[PDB]
Amino acid sequence: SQQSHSSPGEITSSPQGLDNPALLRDMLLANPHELSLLKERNPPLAEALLSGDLEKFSRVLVEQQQDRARREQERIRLFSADPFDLEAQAKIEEDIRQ
């Protein structure tokens, strides 16, 4: 089947839970496929997840984002206009537990 996709300016929506490691950790723990690719492709972020500690998961998440960004900047300078996250899920979190 012939298909197409749109290219709106939503190229910057952090859809992979980049801004919310708490939610991403939760999704990953609940998702055996995603957690599996994660241990295959990214073992240091994965081991942080396996440990349960959101603090290490988040800490490594930022370190990985810095390392992604170092190379990604070189790639996006060539071309960058492909979104995949039409649902672009977001949440508002709070911790008013005293």
Side-chain angles (χ1 to χ4, degrees):
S1 303
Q2 296 184 60
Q3 297 179 78
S4 58
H5 200 262
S6 298
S7 186
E10 288 129 45
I11 312 300
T12 53
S13 309
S14 303
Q16 301 187 339
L18 305 178
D19 269 296
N20 295 94
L23 305 178
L24 179 57
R25 172 215 61 162
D26 219 91
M27 186 186 82
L28 274 161
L29 286 165
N31 195 319
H33 179 85
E34 255 288 311
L35 85 70
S36 186
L37 75 75
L38 188 66
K39 51 169 70 178
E40 193 218 314
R41 303 289 147 87
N42 199 354
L45 183 54
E47 67 183 358
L49 180 82
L50 311 191
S51 195
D53 284 314
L54 182 271
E55 54 175 64
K56 68 199 286 186
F57 181 82
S58 181
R59 177 256 186 180
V60 180
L61 198 93
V62 180
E63 291 177 316
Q64 286 294 309
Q65 284 186 67
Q66 289 179 29
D67 192 38
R68 280 187 186 189
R70 98 180 291 175
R71 53 182 158 273
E72 217 114 295
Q73 281 178 76
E74 307 180 76
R75 304 203 73 181
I76 66 176
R77 277 168 181 180
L78 218 173
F79 63 93
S80 31
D82 195 29
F84 75 103
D85 53 305
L86 302 175
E87 290 274 71
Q89 71 169 312
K91 267 100 199 67
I92 299 169
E93 57 183 59
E94 214 187 45
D95 190 0
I96 55 169
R97 299 293 187 84
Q98 303 82 234

